[PDB]
Structures are given as structure tokens and as C-alpha cells.
A paper describes a structure:
To further decipher mechanisms of such an intrinsic quality control pathway we analysed here the contribution of three yeast large ribosomal subunit r-proteins rpL2 (uL2), [name] (uL23) and rpL34 (eL34) for intermediate nuclear subunit folding steps. Structure models obtained from single particle cryo-electron microscopy analyses provided evidence for specific and hierarchic effects on the stable positioning and remodelling of large ribosomal subunit domains. The structural analyses performed here provide evidence for strong and specific effects on the yeast LSU precursor folding pathway upon blockage of the assembly of three different LSU r-proteins.
Expression shut down of LSU [name] domain I and III binder [name] led to similar effects on the pre-LSU folding pathway. Again, two major folding states, Nog1TAP_L25-A and Nog1TAP_L25-B, were detected in [name]-[name] samples purified from cells where expression of [name] was shut down (see S4 Movie for an animated overview). Both were, again, characterized by the absence of clear densities for LSU [name] domains III, IV and V and the 5S [name] and their associated proteins including [name]. Hence, their overall fold again closely resembled the one of the low-populated Nog1TAP-F state of the control sample. Only minor displacements of [name] main contact sites in LSU [name] domain I (helices 9 and 10) were observed when compared with states of the control sample showing clear [name] densities. The factor and r-protein composition of state Nog1TAP_L25-B largely resembled the one observed in state Nog1TAP-F. On the other hand, in state Nog1TAP_L25-A several factors binding to LSU [name] domains I and II and the ES7 element could not be detected (Ebp2, Brx1, Rpf1, Nsa1, Rrp1, Mak16) (compare Figures K and L in S1 Appendix).
Residue numbers in the entry:
A (entry chain o): 88 to 220
B (entry chain m): 239 to 303
C (entry chain G): 70 to 119, 125 to 233
D (entry chain t): 53 to 105, 127 to 217, 222 to 317
E (entry chain K): 31 to 51, 66 to 301
F (entry chain v): 175 to 227
RNA sequence: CCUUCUCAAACAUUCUGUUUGGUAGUGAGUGAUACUCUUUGGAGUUAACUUGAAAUUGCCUUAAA
């Protein structure tokens, strides 16, 4: 048997969750659609999972989009066996760096840097390379 | 009576072509018939037989008014 | 009913695949009589008063296409499904399969003729393509293979 | 309704994302320029591009002097849905309907909006003769509830409408619009901007070819720079 | 400036390390031969991660030895020129060769933004074409469009990323401007990126390149420019992840944190 | 017999691009648009020279 | 099945030289040990390489009808 969950790959760039929901909403009703995305960057990975309320809608979508060509990408859609419920898929967005580690006093980190430089000199001496300062 | 076809011959793809037929130079060389036609048109233009397209445009621009 | 070789046609490509194939083919329309004539006249005029690369066009002649096939030069072949002398095209699919050249069956010979400035073209094939469309050509070949050989793997069976 | 395919949806989404990125970048650059933090930007001085027939490109800077401009809707890009940022600007000028055009006063505060709505519309400075012809050929006056949009017909109607500022005839409105008059803002809003007829306005054998030729010429004549410091493109509105 | 004795000692130690007591040169010929200097700073250009390249002035850039010594290698050094569509027609390969053959430098190919978006659109083809060239020169106008057309993979390395080159004189395109700017870049500059991070690295080339004394002079010149540019920090001369050799020690920068 | 003006001009380019090195002329892509053999090129060059300096 | 942010100034005006500014990207995978950082949990930098645009889940309406 097959479940309502569907796995779709080879998604063209920019084919986000909203577009998938709008396109697949014609085939009955879709329970939920999720698209894989990277953590550091919000762009999708070109593959996601969508669930259908009824198995007939899922099979119809799979048949229609089995090898559909979409602007240079031939979409491949598979119907998972019975069960195999979709797992979590966070809606990752662009990550912007935030600076927090400047609380230490400058005087303390000065001595820390001096000690680190001395340790580095000792280490490079231990590695078989003779050097000073 | 009614049975599916069998690919006994088509099962294995043909790795090599059928006939060598060494390629002629014309395939790797610009067309000679086009050159002959161009030379014929040049001769016609020189003989005052074919009006060059630019000359036709110039004449028509004066005309129609 | 009809023998397995007959009814192999009419199992054409889907709407999207056929549309994409025709869109790709429309970028390589051979120059019509007027276009070639004007180009030749311009060349003559330039020569009168005083190095182009190989032109790219779709090969469509039945004899020319058949010659291109069996030499593995052709990459994609389009076959009309409404050829009145069916014997002229019955052997084309099997010959292409034996030679391994990707092939497809399209609806209507007039559609093939339109993209080659002809009333009716029995077949339309591509030999060489520009580097820009090479990736597109490979993608179309893969899509056609997936939609024809696997989807219609029984096209050569069940009379 | 009719089935919607995936190709159109994907194309629309990509075009909308590109337009949104362009608008965000342009707005951010303009806001920084207004703040006078011009230390690190591509360009600070404004630029206006004039394209005319063969085609000749002229690049000129924008000064603070007021100027008269005419804007006409273009209905482009093809697969770009108007974003909210541009939607608000279009609604403020009530130019949503295609082929619609109105007269606005060129000012520094209006340059960012013109840049934002640059691809959607075509702008330029019409001559006095063109303005007079446009005003005297088309017009609308809202008449009494007032669900009627009857075309301008009588001079006495002009007296009834405004009256106070000496606007007693269509020529008064023409002078106020062409010249930098005090009532330029008031008359323009009440003028119910014109609904210019479409170019081809036909369909058929010859009409299809003419429309195809016009579309081909439009791409060459009009371009979408999409640059952050894209100069405002101006064409000869007098021809239209 | 830092004494030249320390740099001499560091280069001598690198020379000793390069030699130590399975046919092709997989990674060995590049691991113990590459010369680079690591410069530390307080979040180099932390405001934004721009892909701007800084062309450090060098009396004897590695480009000439790189071309000279690139003959005996599988990878062949090449120069890529990218110009706007309008000016590509005016630019001629024969003229470029004639005006550049005297100096000895050559241009392998000339490309335009139109080509990148049509023939090199494919990711595989784009990667194959970009990887061929080691030096990339792009017209100042088209550098902003290049990242979108050429993707981000080419920017993962200093060699692949484009380098801005001036080609306009009096606001009008001038052949001589490009002709001499390419020469200046080739034999009078050293590109280097400005990463959005504390660490900064400059690739000085292989060890067999410009003589150690010339290498020391180049290191001193680069260090002077870096000091005059940013509030840099401890600097080390390093081979491929080999033991670091400190060269400069900045302390006033810490108090400014 | 005589050589055409275009043929004479092309032979002049071959001459004052390579001179007498027919081997180099055989690989001259710009001038040798038609990949003619070395013998034909040398024969044409000799014929042109016989009627010129 | 739409195409991609194709330059702006100061000096010098030898007709191009000096200085500045504008460049936020398909993803996945492999991988050579240094920088700081806050002390903890890893945040940003640092060689090199494979890829069919490959991939199994990181907690406005005349391209109208």
C-alpha cells in the first residue's frame, strides 16, 4: 500500500512552499507541504515533502507529475509506502551574525594574547622549526 | 496468433555504425554551392542586372512620395 | 486489431514534453527561401565593393534523416504519426532503437513541417546544437527517454 | 476556474522575488542618500536618461527646479505581480488601469517614487501643444449621489466645479497644468486623469503582425535597468 | 618596519621544511610549496561581506613566474577578460595581442556578460570553463552583474573571482586604458580578498617563485600596506597549514576593541 | 588561363602572411578558409608568381 | 518556462594617470590545523577538490475568448 505523504525532488530554484501548495491544491486538498531549507541561508534544497488528505489525490498528483519538465528540471514525485509519516522540517531563513563576545576587558586579553604568543613560539620550537619572537 | 514482438535483434544496441564512408571535405568546409550563387549574383550586379538591396531601398525611399 | 508494429505510433509525448520539444526546435528554424536569398544578395553586394561558423539547422529529410541514423550522428529524431504510406516509417522506431539514437513520435506531420517551413515533414531530427542548448538538449533527451521508453515500454507489445 | 500550471506559478514567483529585491535595494539606497550618508554608495547624484530616435541616449542630472511630467501606464513586466510597495504608489496616483495617464509635479521627494515605478510606466516632459491636444481631446467631470463620469462638455460646468480660482474654461485648466500654477495640484486631482486608447486596438491577420512588430519595438525602445542607481528613462511623449 | 632578519629566518625555515626524506602531483607539490601570510584583525570589514578585491602593489608579482613555470604542469595558466557587450565589438583579439605581445603577456579569451548567461549558464559547463583560467579580469561596469551571472562558486577562491580593471577614459571607452591597466595588474599588483572575519590571508605563491630576498621585500611591502590600511593584528607566514611563523605583533589594536 | 581577382587577393594574403611555408599555410584558419592541400596551395602560389614578381 | 543590481565622484585633462565608493552566491559531499572570540554552547575567518540544476526530513488583463 501507499500513504498520502509524497516526496518531491528536483524542484526548480524559487519553487517555494507557497507555490507547491498553490499548484497541488487543485488535486483535492493537501494536508501540509514542507520544503527542505538550509540553516545558514534561506534558499531551499530543491526537494520537499507534501501530504494529501486522500490517497487518490496523492496518486493522481504522482501520475501527473511523475516526469513533468519544469523549466529545465524534470520533477520526480514518489508515493511513500503505508505509513512513513513526514518528519519535522523547520522553516529556516537567512541567518545574520550577532556580536556578543567583547565583554572581557582589554587589559586581560592583552596578557592572554602575550601568553598565547609565548605558547605559539614554544610550540613552533617543539615542531622542529627554530625561530624567535 | 496474437503475440508480442521480440527484440532478439534490437536487444543489443549497435555500438559501431554500418558503413565507414569517409567524410568529405565539404562537410568540414564552407558550402561551395553558396559561393557559386554569390559569385553569380556578383556577376549579375556587375552587369547592371540586379539592383543591390541598398540601392533598392534608396530608390524606394525617394518613391512612394 | 493491428500487429504490434502498428499501434506503436499514436503513443505520443505528453502535452508538456511535446511543447518543450517544439519550443526548442523553433530556435533552429532553417532559413526560408527569402531569408537565404537576401543573405546571399547581401554577401554579393559586400563582395561587389569589398569566416562564419557552421550553420545550425534541424535535419528533416526522410532519406537524409535515415542516412543520419545508422551512423550515430543524430541525437534526437521526431517521427510523424500520420504518414499515409505507413511503410515509410514503420521501420524508423526499431532502427533507432537498434542504433540507440533517442527518438520520439509526435502528433501530425504538418506540425513537423511548420517548424521546417514545409507543408509536411515526415521526420525531424537534430544532429548538432549550440553549446548554450547542449544542456537543454540533454535534458530534453532524458525527459523524452523517461516518458517514452519507460512509460510506454509496452508500446512494442499487446498488438 | 481554469487549471493553473506550475511553470506560470514558478515564473511569477521568480519575477516577483526579483522585483521585490530590486525595490528593497532601491529604497534602502534612497533612504541612505536622503540621510546624507553618501560616503559609501554607487552614486549620489541623480540621473535622468532621455531616449529618442537611430536611437540616441542622453544622460543628464536632475536639478531642484520644478518640472512638468506626464506618466502613462505600460502594464509591465509581463510576469511581475505589482508589489505592495509599488501598489501603494500606483493607488495614490490611481494609475492601476492600463493606458491611464496623469500629470505630476517633478520634485526631489517624487524622484524615489518615480524610480520605484519606473519599469511600470513611461515618463517624459510633453510640450504645450501636446498637453493642449490631450486636454481638449479627452476629459471627464464627475456629476451628480454622483455615479456619472460624463465627459467634459461645457465651460459653465468648469465654473460650477471650481469657480473660486478663476478656472472658468478648459483653457484655464490647460494653463494651470502646463504652467507651474498654484492650482496645479488642485485641478490635476479633480481632472479625472485621461484614459488613453491602446496602441494597436485590433486583432486579426494584419493586426496580429502589427502588434507583434510593436511589441518587438517596445523592447528596444524601453528597457528595465534594474540597477540600484538606475536613471529615470524619458521618451518623447509628444509622439504619443 | 619589522626587521628583515625575522623574515629571512622564516623563509629559510620554510625552505628547510619544503624538503623531507604515487606518480602524479596530487597534493604534495602544492602543500609544502605554497607561500601565504596570515593577517589577524578585529573583524575585517565587519559591516558587510563584500567580494571586493584589494590590489596590493608589488614590484615583482608572481604572475610572470607563474606563467613561466606553468608550462611544466597539468594545469595551464590563463587570463580571462570580461567586458561589456557594447565594447566587445570594438575590442579585437589581434589588437590586444599586438599591443600586449611586446610586454610578453597574452590574453587567452575575451568574454561578455551575454555569453555567461547563454552558453555558460549550465553549472557543470560554468565550473569547467571558469576553472580553466587562473586570472580573471572584468570591466568595472560589469563586476556588479558578474556574481549573479557567474554564480558564487567562482568567488570561493581568490584566483577564480573577477578583478576590477578600468577601461574608460574621459567617460569614453579607450583601448589603451585596458591595454596598460592589464599590464599594471599583471606585473604591478597582487589581488587579495577582504573576508568578513578576523583572519585575513594573502596567497604569495609557490616557494620556487621570486627569490627569497625578493620574497622578503614583497612581504615587507605587503605588511606596510596592510598596516596603513587596517588596524591589523599578529601576522604569521605560513605554508599549507604548517607551523606558523610570527612576523608582526600589534598591541595598540587590542586597546581599541 | 588566368586567376580571378579574388583568388589573386587571397593568394597575396597567403604570401604576405606566411611567405613560402606551405606547411604553415595549411593550418592557416583565417586565410585558408577552405582546407586545401599543400600541393594545391603551392601550385596556385607558383601560378600567381609566374604572372607577378 | 520570466530573465540576471553592463559605473559615480575628487585631483590631473599627458585623452589616460592617481585616490575613493558600488559586487549578499544552486545545494550537497570530501578535506589540509592557524586566528581571535565569549567561556561554551560554537560565532565569524583559513588550503584544496567531485557534481546532469544531481537532491528522502539538521530543534496591471487584446500572449482575452
Amino acid at each position: 500500500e501507499y500513504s498520502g505523504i509524497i516526496y518531491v525532488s528536483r524542484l526548480p530554484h524559487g519553487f517555494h512552499e507557497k507555490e507547491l501548495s498553490k499548484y497541488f491544491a487543485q488535486f483535492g486538498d493537501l494536508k501540509e507541504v514542507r520544503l527542505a531549507r538550509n540553516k545558514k541561508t534561506g534558499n531551499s534544497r530543491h526537494y520537499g515533502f507534501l501530504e494529501f488528505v486522500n490517497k487518490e489525490d496523492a496518486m493522481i498528483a504522482q501520475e501527473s507529475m511523475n516526469n513533468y519538465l519544469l523549466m529545465g528540471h524534470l520533477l520526480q514525485v514518489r508515493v511513500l509506502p503505508k505509513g512513513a509519516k513526514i518528519e519535522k522540517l523547520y522553516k529556516y531563513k537567512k541567518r545574520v551574525l550577532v556580536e556578543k563576545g567583547i565583554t572581557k576587558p582589554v587589559k586581560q586579553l592583552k596578557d592572554n594574547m602575550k601568553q598565547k604568543h609565548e605558547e605559539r613560539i614554544k610550540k613552533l620550537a617543539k615542531s622542529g622549526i627554530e625561530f624567535k619572537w | 496468433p496474437y503475440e508480442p514482438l521480440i527484440d532478439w535483434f534490437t536487444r543489443h544496441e549497435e555500438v559501431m555504425p554500418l558503413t565507414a564512408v569517409p567524410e568529405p571535405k565539404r562537410r568540414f568546409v564552407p558550402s561551395k554551392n553558396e559561393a557559386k550563387r554569390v559569385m553569380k549574383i556578383v556577376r549579375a550586379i556587375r552587369e547592371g542586372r540586379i539592383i543591390p538591396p541598398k540601392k533598392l531601398k534608396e530608390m524606394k525611399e525617394k518613391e512612394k512620395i | 486489431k493491428v500487429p504490434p508494429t502498428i499501434a506503436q505510433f499514436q503513443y505520443t509525448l505528453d502535452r508538456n514534453t511535446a511543447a518543450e520539444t517544439f519550443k526548442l526546435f523553433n530556435k533552429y528554424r532553417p532559413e526560408t527561401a527569402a531569408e537565404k536569398k537576401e543573405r546571399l544578395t547581401k554577401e554579393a553586394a559586400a563582395v561587389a565593393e569589398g569566416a562564419s561558423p557552421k550553420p545550425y539547422a534541424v535535419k528533416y529529410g526522410l532519406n537524409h534523416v535515415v542516412a543520419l541514423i545508422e551512423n550515430k550522428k543524430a541525437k534526437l529524431v521526431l517521427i510523424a504519426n500520420d504518414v499515409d504510406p505507413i511503410e515509410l516509417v514503420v521501420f524508423l522506431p526499431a532502427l533507432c532503437k537498434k542504433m540507440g539514437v533517442p527518438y520520439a513520435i509526435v502528433k501530425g506531420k504538418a506540425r513537423l513541417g511548420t517548424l521546417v517551413n514545409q507543408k509536411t515533414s515526415a521526420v525531424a531530427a537534430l544532429t548538432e546544437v549550440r553549446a548554450e542548448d547542449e544542456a537543454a538538449l540533454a535534458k530534453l533527451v532524458s525527459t523524452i527517454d523517461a516518458n517514452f521508453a519507460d512509460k510506454y515500454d509496452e508500446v512494442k507489445k499487446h498488438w | 476556474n481554469k487549471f493553473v500550471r506550475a511553470e506560470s506559478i514558478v515564473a511569477k514567483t521568480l519575477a516577483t522575488s526579483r522585483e521585490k529585491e530590486r525595490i528593497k535595494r532601491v529604497s534602502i539606497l534612497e533612504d541612505k542618500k536622503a540621510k546624507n550618508e553618501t560616503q559609501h554608495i554607487a552614486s549620489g547624484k541623480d540621473f535622468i536618461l532621455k531616449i529618442t530616435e537611430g536611437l540616441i541616449r542622453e544622460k543628464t542630472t536632475y536639478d531642484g527646479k520644478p518640472a512638468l511630467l506626464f506618466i502613462v501606464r505600460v502594464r509591465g513586466p509581463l510576469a511581475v505581480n505589482i508589489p505592495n510597495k509599488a501598489f501603494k504608489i500606483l493607488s495614490l496616483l490611481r494609475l492601476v488601469e492600463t493606458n491611464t495617464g496623469v500629470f505630476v509635479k517633478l520634485t526631489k521627494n517624487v524622484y524615489p517614487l518615480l524610480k520605484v515605478i519606473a519599469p511600470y510606466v513611461v515618463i517624459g516632459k510633453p510640450s504645450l501643444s501636446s498637453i493642449r491636444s490631450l486636454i481638449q481631446k479627452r476629459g471627464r467631470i464627475i456629476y451628480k449621489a454622483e455615479p456619472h463620469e460624463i465627459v467634459l462638455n461645457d465651460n459653465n460646468i468648469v465654473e460650477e466645479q471650481l469657480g473660486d480660482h478663476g478656472i472658468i474654461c478648459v483653457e484655464d485648466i490647460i494653463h494651470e497644468i502646463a504652467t507651474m500654477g498654484e492650482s496645479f495640484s488642485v485641478c490635476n486631482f479633480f481632472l479625472q486623469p485621461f484614459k488613453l486608447n491602446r496602441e494597436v486596438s485590433g486583432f486579426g491577420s494584419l493586426n496580429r503582425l502589427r502588434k507583434i512588430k510593436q511589441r518587438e519595438a517596445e523592447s528596444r525602445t524601453r528597457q528595465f535597468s534594474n540597477a540600484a542607481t538606475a536613471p529615470v528613462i524619458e521618451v518623447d511623449i509628444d509622439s504619443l | 618596519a619589522i626587521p628583515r632578519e625575522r623574515v629571512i629566518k622564516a623563509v629559510n625555515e620554510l625552505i628547510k621544511f619544503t624538503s623531507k626524506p604515487l606518480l602524479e602531483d596530487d597534493e604534495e607539490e602544492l602543500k609544502k610549496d605554497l607561500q601565504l601570510i596570515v593577517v589577524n584583525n578585529k573583524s575585517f570589514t565587519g559591516t558587510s561581506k563584500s567580494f571586493k578585491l584589494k590590489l596590493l602593489n608589488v614590484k615583482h608579482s608572481f604572475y610572470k613566474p607563474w606563467k613561466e613555470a606553468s608550462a611544466t604542469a597539468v594545469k595551464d595558466f590563463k587570463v580571462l577578460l570580461i567586458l561589456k557587450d557594447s565594447d566587445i565589438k570594438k575590442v579585437s583579439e589581434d589588437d590586444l595581442f599586438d599591443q600586449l605581445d611586446s610586454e610578453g603577456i597574452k590574453v587567452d579569451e575575451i568574454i561578455c556578460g551575454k555569453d555567461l548567461k547563454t552558453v555558460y549558464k549550465a553549472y557543470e559547463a560554468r565550473n569547467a570553463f571558469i576553472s580553466q583560467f587562473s586570472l580573471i579580469l572584468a570591466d568595472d561596469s560589469i563586476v556588479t552583474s558578474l556574481p549573479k551571472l557567474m554564480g558564487g562558486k567562482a568567488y570561493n577562491k581568490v584566483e577564480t573571482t573577477p578583478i576590477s580593471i578600468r577601461t574608460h577614459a574621459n567617460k569614453e571607452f579607450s583601448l589603451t586604458t585596458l591595454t596598460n591597466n592589464i599590464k599594471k595588474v599583471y606585473m604591478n599588483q597582487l589581488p587579495v580578498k577582504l573576508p568578513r572575519g578576523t583572519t585575513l590571508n594573502v596567497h604569495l605563491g609557490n616557494l620556487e617563485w621570486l627569490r627569497p630576498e625578493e620574497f622578503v621585500d614583497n612581504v615587507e611591502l605587503i605588511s606596510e600596506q596592510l598596516i596603513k590600511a587596517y588596524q591589523i593584528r599578529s601576522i604569521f607566514i605560513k605554508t599549507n597549514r604548517s607551523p606558523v611563523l610570527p612576523l608582526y605583533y600589534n598591541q595598540d589594536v587590542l586597546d581599541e576593541l | 588561363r588566368s586567376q580571378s581577382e579574388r583568388e589573386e587577393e587571397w593568394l597575396e594574403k597567403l604570401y604576405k602572411k606566411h611567405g613560402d611555408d606551405y606547411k604553415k599555410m595549411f593550418f592557416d584558419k583565417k586565410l585558408n578558409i577552405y582546407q586545401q592541400s599543400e600541393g594545391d596551395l603551392k601550385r596556385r602560389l607558383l601560378r600567381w608568381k609566374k604572372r607577378n614578381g
